[PDB]
Swiss-Prot record, chain A:
Induction: Expressed during growth in culture; expression increases from lag to exponential phase. Has a weak SigL-independent promoter, is also weakly autoregulated, no other sigma factor allows its transcription. Forms an operon with rslA. Residues 52-71 bind DNA. Sigma factors are initiation factors that promote the attachment of RNA polymerase to specific initiation sites and are then released. Extracytoplasmic function (ECF) sigma factors are held in an inactive form by an anti-sigma factor until released by regulated intramembrane proteolysis. Over-expression of SigL induces 19-28 genes including polyketide synthases, secreted and membrane proteins. Might play a minor role in regulating SigB. This is ECF RNA polymerase sigma factor SigL. Disruption phenotype: In a single sigL or double sigL-rslA disruption mutant, no visible phenotype; not more susceptible than the parental strain to several oxidative and nitrosative stresses. Infected BALB/c or DBA/2 mice showed a significantly prolonged survival time relative to mice infected with wild-type bacteria, although bacteria proliferate normally. The chain holds residues 90 to 177 of 177 of the full protein. Belongs to the sigma-70 factor family. ECF subfamily. It comes from Mycobacterium tuberculosis (strain ATCC 25618 / H37Rv). Residues 30-78 are annotated as: Sigma-70 factor domain-4. Interacts transiently with the RNA polymerase catalytic core formed by RpoA, RpoB, RpoC and RpoZ (2 alpha, 1 beta, 1 beta' and 1 omega subunit) to form the RNA polymerase holoenzyme that can initiate transcription. Interacts (via sigma-70 factor domain-4) with anti-sigma-L factor RslA.
Swiss-Prot record, chain B:
The gene is rpoC. Transmembrane segments: none annotated. It comes from Mycobacterium tuberculosis (strain ATCC 25618 / H37Rv). DNA-dependent RNA polymerase catalyzes the transcription of DNA into RNA using the four ribonucleoside triphosphates as substrates. Signal peptide: none annotated. Induction: 6-fold repressed by starvation. It comes from the Bacteria. The RNAP catalytic core consists of 2 alpha, 1 beta, 1 beta' and 1 omega subunit. When a sigma factor is associated with the core the holoenzyme is formed, which can initiate transcription. Belongs to the RNA polymerase beta' chain family. This is DNA-directed RNA polymerase subunit beta'.
From Swiss-Prot, chain D:
This is DNA-directed RNA polymerase subunit beta. CDD domains: RNA_pol_B_RPB2. Changing S410T: In strain: vr3; rifampicin-resistant. It is an enzyme of class 2 (transferase). Its EC number is 2.7.7.6. HAMAP family: RNApol_bact_RpoB. Changing I120A: Weakens interaction with TRCF and CarD. NCBIfam families: PRK00405.1 (NF001616), rpoB (TIGR02013). Changing S122A: Does not affect association with TRCF, but weakens interaction with CarD. Changing H424R: In strain: vr7; rifampicin-resistant. It comes from Mycobacterium tuberculosis (strain ATCC 25618 / H37Rv).
DNA sequence: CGTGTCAGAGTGTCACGGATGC
DNA sequence: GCATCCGTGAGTCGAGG
RNA sequence: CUCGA
């Protein structure tokens, strides 16, 4: 039906990364205020996307130890974000 | 060949460019504009830069 | 003239055999994108119809070679493969071009580089830029020669990241995230903050066509109400700008060097004389000369 | 009085010349062309009195040409007859609402003729839903009013050219035979004194190669062309001889690659030029040949085909012109001159209107179906065939759909104001298919031709790249069934003006001489002077005896367009600013309330009525009931007709089309009288603006070269306030992971933003909405595998599960704001036909009330344009002696350059209209008012007047009116006999040192408002391929720092600004994000990287088998975030 | 070339119908070539650049 | 990726260079599937050749998570990186 | 899938230089 | 050896389809 | 296609 070179076809656009850049800045701020154990566990589950047992094998710790650290480190960030007015 | 291909006769310049295998020293106003370097003029010359 | 071609192949060490291709490269897909339409159907770049025709005729030739088809079909097929690669690289160069639906010539790969719509002139010598706007220009006699009046709504969006910075400094906003929502919603705090931001931060004014370098001049912005740009009456000669519906563009220099180039090199007060002749341009011209 | 025919307001005209013929129907061009196409009774009755015998409509004309369809044997035949229409499928406004097409089903009578069976089955066959033309002269395709524009094309015929050679500097000659359809044929004499012929743009063969193939012996050729030595050199230099030899020579150059048979070339050389299948000169094309060559000039037009006799007479016509001959008679033909044709003359340039442009599309669509018929005959049996089985209407309706859907002639209707719409229907466009390319239109097609007098306007034309290529039809002009434009004239017998009026075509006008309209004429009809200014062929103006005048112009304004004829004192404005004056009247914006101008031309009444945006009474009667919604009229016979008002409807261009009743309860209204008027109408007259108190003086530089100063009274009293309506739209589709749903529940949004929404997620009627407010709450399900690492962490640190949907709500664009006035919802659930894949569709109408702002573009009727430079408080404005402040301050410097004194003359007459006047009747009528009508000797305040174009008020009478202007309520005369008045500086109090011209001028608000034309962008969307910011305001894009603008930077030496513009501010993927972070962090601006656009350039040079590599200072190639595999 | 008959009226007086018509011939071709003369101008400019 | 590099060299592209660039041959003439929007294998949009439509999402659907970064899927042949490669990975047609 | 009359495109630029060609 | 013919170029910016 | 400087 259509050809992009032909007129009358809308060109593709991609939105700006402003909202993503600001969140990444705030996430990087709240990350520094974490213990070296907690920061090195959320960055292996959400930034590296590993499994619960994969992080346990790397850090040389127990299975439930990774579960407990992630459970708090998430709430620790929610504390730091809500104290700065980050919208729920 | 980069300053010429953006002026006129794009194919005629690009054909003779690959045959003679010309290499372009990126030192010129029109060239640095394309690649994003400071133009070698005004506040871009090495004296003031 | 023959030696010019022959001597080049000898010294360089590249074989002339490259002029004959055994394989043709395919440009990555995002440079020939196929977009879906709001009617359900699709629309693809012409390069996809050219690459498809080369593939169609090249695969049919592979069948004829396997089948041992008569030399008349194989030779007449090989000819069409040559015309296909010729159309993919420069459709229309030899003979009549490959028409698409509606007798429109398809755009080949070499069409992406030629002329005003080509890659060089359209997307390399000139680009669209962030931190810029445009509106109608209106004469403002009260402005000083180094000043210009731009609308408040224009400045807020133009200086949006700078306003967001100060909104979190003065604690009008909790975080930078909510500071962005304040500018999009135009909370009353931004208008007091916006004035602090544009303080002695020069802006660039331009009117097409940009005939000489004074077609772009730097000014000190002053927040004015309304939606029109207020231009000084003396720079009208340089811009060749009358006030019968003209529009001008505004560009905001960000880096320290860019502001310094606007403050010193491009400021309207530092460019009263014409660089072509040396005679002044920002001088009494119409009502001003009659009044004097 | 002016226009005492419909019952309109009494505008008093400064008319010294009587009007012999009243203005025709301004919509006839669109109306008459379509009535002929569908064979309406009105067209048939018009043709009956025209003298026609058995006339045939455009649809019938296509069916008769089509009939009959037969195979190679002749055993099967199909025929069509009696085309008829059923009632319209849906009313006009219903199609605008539901976005369908206004059409009526077309029925025809078809029958199958079988010679071998002796019986025929005839029945009614439905052909297709046929797009119908509204009474306003428009079509409605998918709910948008469109206008089929009349096209100026090269008329069919034989045309001769006198070209001058480049290298040998000898006068050459060429011929073109342009058929109404089929193959072309052009003969020419080159610089070697030889004659040749190109056939269908193929290679140029010697002219005798064609003559030998048609059966002409080499001897009979020498007998016919022997008187010239250039033809004796042609048969000798000829290559091949023989009837069966040059016939194959033509075959191998025309259809190469095919076996040449003596009977395969004998077949096509007859079918391509002499069989009505693949060749046809129209009834106008045949007629244009039979006059140019001087043959068959008496025979009734029956041959719809080129003949062999014409080809010889054409070559005979050419060779004589080459050697200086001026006269030729074809053997057995009348005498005719030998000359070259203009092709710009309106007798050789043809106008094809709506009916023909649609007829040609129907003809092409029928031919595609015809091939389906012949194919379906030889496949199916010859005994179960009915007309329904042979007919596949798919290629027919798809041919009319493709035309109205996509065509340079099917144009989105101009709907700024009624005048813009009326002008759009009367446009004549050279561009389009069959005409010319914009890149091939030279400076000769575009300029004014002397044959355009009274046919196409010499003023009204755009000043952009389409100058000259688009014109407007003159007022009294009309089109004959051939395609040429006729203009009326009064036949002068022997220096005696007669009331007999006859329409002459362009070439018919040259065979006589016509007197200018403003000729001094006796009450009996005899010219006062023996020598009178008269127009002659080839654009010659000279005096000539009174016994030589054959005709004379109907009205002075006969040569101008309708919009051009609306500029008072047009004869005092140069053509440059006059063009802008008419072009900007079509750009006026319909205001909240409308006032008719004090200074008029008389055309304002008919322009509004004929445009079709008012409400005229069809039949005489009394007003039974009147409301803001509808008007009911009780007729004399007893029937009732009710007219519904169009209230606050969005036009094509966002202007407010709003009709208002004029009559009251129990008013006797005559037939054809305005009972209600719409946008830009006041009591039935074009009210494109307002009457403003103007002072002509510089004022503190706020009106510096064409800027305008306005009194804030125009803001406080909504004088220049206009309503604008925008349409916003969004739909709910089916996605891969679910379905988009329109719902009030939107993730992570407060109850405060959603407060203006109803329970469905739609904004409620009446709610005022700024930019960014939600109009329709739509959420689309997004997959889990599409989540940012930070977004998945941010989702975990907020504990919000089940939010697999993201926000895709319809929000208000930047720069929009107003009240929500209407909502329309379309749901697949509720039988509403949506495109496949959609479940719901919502349209929200937002109306803004736009007061006049700083920078909004105002203009008058004389090409005096300008933006609002300053809106002073009412006290700051310079005010008159009685405290009344002026409304608008126009700079003096922008008056004597433009040569548009009409604004000064209007300002004078405008004041006299505002105040009124009384001429001294005692001691007789003064010597300046002797020519004025008696109705003008006394005027009341706020009187309305007409200054017809090229007639109207003279400076002798205008000077005399300023001397007797009526005093105000206090008894004081404010303006002097010069027209100037004493003003007071409202800012200081001191009176202005000199008197200033003060009066009333009609000012229009043009559709160039800052509310639309302001735009700015920090960041936003980027074009996916080039990674540069989008373009245009609607896409929230950035400005283009073009090629010329980069030279300015380099001329300054501003290197960092130049690098900054092209990198971090544009297409640097990482630099732009890091700059935004560096600003919100307060850090410094980082270092610019490499443009992604340059990365694409290299990847594109690679696709052309060019090995481009980037080398470092040492010489090693460096990659750009990529490798290479095999 | 100039028309052998001049426009004797002034714009203050008021041109006749034929006087106005012959004037438009030069006015329209004045605007018409102004678009072409700027094209060859802007082309000569970018060549000089 | 610094912005100081002296020369920009151009030359004829050997038919052996074209294969050195290409991440696979475009065999079939098909484009995508007009229901699933998934590109057909060895077509003009093949993910095995040019790259994945979505980031870290393969064709066969086995690898959709980020933890398998850099794995060449065995069932569909697609690598698992970001869709940024689909702007720079070249293909080629082998002519008969 | 198998296939057995034949039905057939756009047309108003031009200046200028140099390789192309009888 | 030269007339022919091919290929090159022909302002910038903005708004709505 | 249509218009604005
Ligand atoms: Mg202007
Ligand atoms: Zn896979």
């Amino acid at each position: 039906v259509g050809s992009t070179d032909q007129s009358g076809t809308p060109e593709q656009s991609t939105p700006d990364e402003v909202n993503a850049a600001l969140d990444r800045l705030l996430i990087a701020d709240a990350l520094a205020q974490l213990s070296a154990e907690h920061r090195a566990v959320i960055q292996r589950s959400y930034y590296r996307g590993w499994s619960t047992a994969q992080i346990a094998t790397d850090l040389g710790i127990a299975e439930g130890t990774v579960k407990s650290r992630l459970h708090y480190a998430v709430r620790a960030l929610r504390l730091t974000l809500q104290e700065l007015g980050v919208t729920r | 060949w980069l300053s010429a291909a953006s002026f006129q006769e794009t194919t005629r310049v690009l054909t003779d460019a690959a045959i003679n295998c010309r290499s372009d020293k990126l030192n010129g106003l029109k060239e640095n504009v394309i690649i994003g370097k400071l133009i070698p003029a005004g506040t871009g010359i090495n004296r003031y830069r | 003239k023959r030696l010019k071609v022959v001597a080049a192949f000898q010294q360089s060490g590249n074989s002339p055999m490259g002029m004959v291709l055994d394989a043709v490269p395919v440009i990555p897909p995002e440079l020939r994108p196929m977009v879906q339409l709001d009617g359900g159907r699709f629309a693809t770049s012409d390069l996809n119809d050219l690459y498809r025709r080369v593939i169609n005729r090249n695969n049919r030739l592979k069948r004829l070679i396997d089948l041992g088809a008569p030399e008349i079909i194989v030779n007449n097929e090989k000819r069409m493969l040559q015309e296909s690669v010729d159309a993919l690289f420069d459709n229309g160069r030899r003979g009549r071009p490959v028409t698409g639906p509606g007798n429109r010539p398809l755009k080949s790969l070499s069409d992406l580089l030629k002329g005003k719509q080509g890659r060089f002139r359209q997307n390399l010598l000139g680009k669209r830029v962030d931190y810029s706007g445009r509106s109608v220009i209106v004469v403002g006699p009260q402005l000083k020669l180094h000043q210009c009046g731009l609308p408040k709504l224009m400045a807020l969006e133009l200086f949006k990241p700078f306003v967001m910075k100060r909104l979190v400094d003065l604690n009008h906003a909790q975080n930078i995230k909510s500071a962005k929502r304040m500018v999009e919603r135009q909370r009353p705090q931004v208008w007091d903050v916006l004035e602090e931001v544009i303080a002695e931060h020069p802006v660039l004014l331009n009117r097409a066509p940009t005939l000489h370098r004074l077609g772009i001049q730097a000014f000190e912005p002053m927040l004015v109400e309304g939606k029109a740009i207020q231009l000084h009456p003396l720079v009208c000669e340089a811009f060749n700008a009358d006030f019968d519906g003209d529009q001008m563009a505004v560009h905001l220099p960000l880096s320290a060097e860019a502001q310094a180039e606007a403050r010193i090199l491009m400021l309207s007060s530092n460019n009263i004389l014409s660089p072509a002749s040396g005679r002044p341009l920002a001088m009494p011209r119409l009502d001003m000369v009659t009044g004097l | 009085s002016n226009n005492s025919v419909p019952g309109a307001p009494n505008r008093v005209s400064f008319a010294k010349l009587r009007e012999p013929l009243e203005v025709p129907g301004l919509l006839d061009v669109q109306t008459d062309s379509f009535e002929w196409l569908i064979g309406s009774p009105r067209w048939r009755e018009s043709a009956a009195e025209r003298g026609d015998v058995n006339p045939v409509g455009g649809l019938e004309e296509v069916l008769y040409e089509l009939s009959p369809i037969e195979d190679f044997s002749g055993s099967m035949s199909l025929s069509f007859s009696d085309p008829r229409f059923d009632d319209v499928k849906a009313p006009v406004d219903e199609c605008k609402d539901k976005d369908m097409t206004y059409a009526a089903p077309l029925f025809v009578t078809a029958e199958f003729i079988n010679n071998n069976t002796g019986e025929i089955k005839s029945q009614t066959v439905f052909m297709g839903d046929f797009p119908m033309m509204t009474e306003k002269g428009t079509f409605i395709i998918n709910g948008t009013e469109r206008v089929v524009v009349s096209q100026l094309v090269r008329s069919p015929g034989v045309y001769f050219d006198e070209t001058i050679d480049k290298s040998t500097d000898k006068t050459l000659h060429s011929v073109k035979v342009i058929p109404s359809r089929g193959a072309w044929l052009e003969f020419d004499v080159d610089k070697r004194d030889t004659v040749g012929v190109r056939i269908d743009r193929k290679r140029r063969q010697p002219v005798t190669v064609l003559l030998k193939a048609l059966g002409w012996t080499s001897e009979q050729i020498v007998e016919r062309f022997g008187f010239s030595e250039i033809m004796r050199s042609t048969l000798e230099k000829d290559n091949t001889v023989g009837t069966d030899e040059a016939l194959l020579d033509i075959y191998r150059k025309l259809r190469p690659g095919e076996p040449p048979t003596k009977e395969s070339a004998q077949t096509l050389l007859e079918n391509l030029f002499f069989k009505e299948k693949r060749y046809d000169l129209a009834r106008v094309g045949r007629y244009k040949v039979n006059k140019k060559l001087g043959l068959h000039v008496g025979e009734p037009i029956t041959s719809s085909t080129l003949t062999e006799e014409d080809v010889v007479a054409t070559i005979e016509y050419l060779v004589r012109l080459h050697e200086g001959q001026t006269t030729m008679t074809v053997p057995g033909g009348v005498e005719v001159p030998v000359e070259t044709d203009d092709i710009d003359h309106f007798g050789n340039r043809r106008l094809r209107t709506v009916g023909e442009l649609i007829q040609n599309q129907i003809r092409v669509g029928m031919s595609r179906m015809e091939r389906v018929v012949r194919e379906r005959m030889t496949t199916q049996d010859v005994e179960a065939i009915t007309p329904q089985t042979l007919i596949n209407i798919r290629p027919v309706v798809a041919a009319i759909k493709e035309f109205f859907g996509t065509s340079q002639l099917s144009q989105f209707m101009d709907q700024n104001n009624p005048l813009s719409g009326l002008t759009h229907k009367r446009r004549l466009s050279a561009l389009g298919p069959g005409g010319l390319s914009r890149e091939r239109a030279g400076l000769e097609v575009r300029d004014v031709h002397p044959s355009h007098y009274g046919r196409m306007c010499p003023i009204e034309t755009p000043e952009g790249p389409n100058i000259g290529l688009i014109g407007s039809l003159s007022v009294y002009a009309r089109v004959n069934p051939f395609g040429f434009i006729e203009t009326p004239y009064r036949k002068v017998v022997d220096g005696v003006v007669s009331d007999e009026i006859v329409y002459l075509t362009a070439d018919e006008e040259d065979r006589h001489v016509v007197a200018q309209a403003n000729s001094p004429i006796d009450a009996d009809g005899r010219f006062v002077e023996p020598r009178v200014l008269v127009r002659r062929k080839a654009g010659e103006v000279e005096y000539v005896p009174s016994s030589e005048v054959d005709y004379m112009d109907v009205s002075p304004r006969q040569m101008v367009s309708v919009a051009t004829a609306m500029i008072p004192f047009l004869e005092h404005d140069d053509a440059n600013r006059a063009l802008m004056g008419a072009n900007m009247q079509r750009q006026a914006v319909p205001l909240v309330r409308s006032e008719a101008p004090l200074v008029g031309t008389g055309m304002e009444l008919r322009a509004a009525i004929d445009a079709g945006d008012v409400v005229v009474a069809e039949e005489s009667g009394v007003i039974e009931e009147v409301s803001a919604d509808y008007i009911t009229v009780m007729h004399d016979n007893g029937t009732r007709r009710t007219y519904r008002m169009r209230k606050f409807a969005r036009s094509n261009h966002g202007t407010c089309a709003n009709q208002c009743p004029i009559v009251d309860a129990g008013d006797r209204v005559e037939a054809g009288q305005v009972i209600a008027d719409g946008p830009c109408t006041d009591d039935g007259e074009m009210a494109l603006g307002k009457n403003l108190l103007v002072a002509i003086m510089p004022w503190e530089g706020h009106n510096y070269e064409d800027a305008i100063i306005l009194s804030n009274r125009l803001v406080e009293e909504d004088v220049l306030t206009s309503i604008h309506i925008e349409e916003h739209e969004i739909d709910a589709r089916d996605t891969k992971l679910g379905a988009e749903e329109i719902t009030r529940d939107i993730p992570n949004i407060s109850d405060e933003v959603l407060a203006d929404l109803d329970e469905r997620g739609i904004v409620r009627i009446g709610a005022e909405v700024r930019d960014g407010d939600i109009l329709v709450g739509k959420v689309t399900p997004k997959g889990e595998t599409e989540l940012t690492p930070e977004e998945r962490l941010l989702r975990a640190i907020f504990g919000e599960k089940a939010r697999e949907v993201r926000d895709t709500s319809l929000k208000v664009p930047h720069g929009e704001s107003g009240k929500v006035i209407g909502i329309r919802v379309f749901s697949r659930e509720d039988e509403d036909e949506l495109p496949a894949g959609v479940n719901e569709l919502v349209r929200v109408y937002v109306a803004q009330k736009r007061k006049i702002s700083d920078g909004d573009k105002l203009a008058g009727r004389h090409g005096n344009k300008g933006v609002i430079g300053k809106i002073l408080p009412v006290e700051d404005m310079p005010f008159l002696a009685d405290g009344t402040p002026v409304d608008i301050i126009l700079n003096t410097h922008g008056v004597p350059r433009r040569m548009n004194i009409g604004q000064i003359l209007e300002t004078h007459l405008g004041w006299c209209a505002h105040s009124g006047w009384k001429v001294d009747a005692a001691k007789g009528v003064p010597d300046w008012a002797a020519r004025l009508p008696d109705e003008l000797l006394e005027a009341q305040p706020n009187a309305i007047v007409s200054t017809p174009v090229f007639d109207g008020a003279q400076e002798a009478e205008l000077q005399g009116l300023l001397s007797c202007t009526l005093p105000n309520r206090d008894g004081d005369v404010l303006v002097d006999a010069d027209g100037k008045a004493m003003l007071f500086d409202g800012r200081s109090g001191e009176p202005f040192p000199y008197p200033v011209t003060v009066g009333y001028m009609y000012i229009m608000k043009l559709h160039h408002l800052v509310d639309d034309k302001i735009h700015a962008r920090s960041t936003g969307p980027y074009s996916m391929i080039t990674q540069q910011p989008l373009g245009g305001k609607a896409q929230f894009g950035g400005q283009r720092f073009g090629e010329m603008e980069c030279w300015a930077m380099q001329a300054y030496g501003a290197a960092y600004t130049l690098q900054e513009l092209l990198t971090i501010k544009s297409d640097d993927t990482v630099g732009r994000v890091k700059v935004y972070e560096a600003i919100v962090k307060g850090e410094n601006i980082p270092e610019p990287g490499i443009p992604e656009s340059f990365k694409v350039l290299l990847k594109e040079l690679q696709s052309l088998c060019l090995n481009v590599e980037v080398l470092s200072s040492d010489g090693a190639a460096i990659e750009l975030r990529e490798g290479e595999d095999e | 070339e100039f028309i052998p008959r001049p426009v004797k009226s002034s714009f203050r007086e008021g041109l006749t119908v034929l006087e106005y018509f012959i004037n438009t011939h030069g006015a329209r071709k004045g605007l018409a070539d102004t678009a072409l003369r700027t094209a060859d101008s802007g082309y000569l400019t970018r060549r000089l650049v | 990726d610094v912005n100081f590099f002296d020369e920009l060299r151009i030359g004829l592209a050997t038919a052996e260079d074209i294969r050195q660039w290409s991440y696979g041959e475009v065999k079939k003439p098909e484009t995508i599937n007009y229901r699933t929007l998934k590109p057909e294998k060895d077509g003009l949009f093949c993910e095995k050749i040019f790259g994945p439509t979505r980031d870290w999402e393969c064709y066969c659907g086995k690898y959709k998570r980020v933890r398998f970064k850099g794995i060449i899927c065995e069932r569909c042949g697609v690598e698992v990186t970001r869709a940024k490669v689909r702007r720079e990975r070249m293909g080629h047609i082998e002519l008969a």
